[PDB]
């Protein structure tokens, strides 16, 4: 078949992935996020936060 | 007297002179080519800057609990003009302060004590308060 399929991803914006579906572009790490800012908003009601200010 | 009582601008300018009389302080060769910190743009005007800075070294050890080569630099560091970029703080030289403190320790006015830092010898503490009253003897406090 092939002798390659991959090349070093060890750092950068391609070796971390966000939990929408493996979406990116929307660089995220904060306090152990790995969680997408669009959906973070939809989880304002869900637990982690309730808005108070 | 305690060194607290007197002015400190006066303190150093008599303590620097004191040392240079007594043959004290074996100085590094590099002393006429030395910028003295990363945030300067020039060498000092002073030709006896080493004597002056050793004064200020020994004084701070009298007050605070004593700390190493890192902390001395942080006390001395200032503002760095990066030109077109906005100014920021940064630390100065290290290898100068590492020669200062070892030169003092050769005279046994300081010594590596416990709890991660040099502390000033009782012989050192004697000599500070000895000249502290000499300041008040001079002008009149």
């Amino acid at each position: 078949q092939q002798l390659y399929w991959s090349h070093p991803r060890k750092f950068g914006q391609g070796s971390r992935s966000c939990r929408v579906c493996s979406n990116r572009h929307g660089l995220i790490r904060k306090y152990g996020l790995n969680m997408c800012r669009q959906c973070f908003r939809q989880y304002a009601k869900d637990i982690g936060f309730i808005k108070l200010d | 007297v305690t060194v607290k009582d007197v002015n400190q601008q006066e303190f150093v300018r008599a303590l620097a002179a004191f040392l240079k009389k007594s043959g004290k302080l074996k100085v590094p060769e590099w002393v006429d080519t030395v910028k003295l910190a990363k945030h300067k743009e020039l060498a000092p005007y002073d030709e006896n800057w080493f004597y002056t800075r050793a004064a200020s070294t020994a004084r701070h050890l009298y007050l605070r609990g004593g700390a190493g080569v890192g902390s001395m630099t942080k006390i001395y560091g200032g503002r760095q003009r990066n030109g077109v970029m906005p100014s920021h703080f940064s630390r100065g030289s290290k290898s100068v302060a590492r020669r200062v403190l070892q030169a003092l320790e050769g005279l046994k006015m300081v010594e590596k004590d416990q709890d991660w830092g040099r502390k000033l010898t009782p012989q050192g503490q004697r000599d500070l308060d000895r000249i502290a009253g000499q300041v008040a003897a001079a002008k009149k406090k």
Binding site: - | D32, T33, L42, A43, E47
Partner: protein
Amino acid sequence: PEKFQHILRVLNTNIDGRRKIAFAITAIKGVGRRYAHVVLRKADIDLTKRAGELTEDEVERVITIMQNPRQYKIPDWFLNRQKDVKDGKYSQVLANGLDNKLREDLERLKKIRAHRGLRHFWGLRVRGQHTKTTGRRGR
């Protein structure tokens, strides 16, 4: 007092006796203010007086301490040039030789015709810079 002399000529640039010694010397190319406050102290003379108050005996020593800096124990890192390239030594370059040296390195980078010499010959910025909104002479 001290009416003896004023403006003078030294190597390749005319230096006034109006200004302080260190700052006067800087006008000569290849010598900045930082380079001069060293060389004066190796020469063991005052920098606290004017350049018109130096004698001929003194300034004769200045240029020697300048042009052989390694032999008067000014460090290698403190020079303009360390291993020029294709000349094999540490060097210190002064006024009219500086320009001659400079023009060589331009010529060299069009000889090989690297990216550098092309950018030079086209009159565009050598280093990583945008030219889209930078320049104008034109508009």
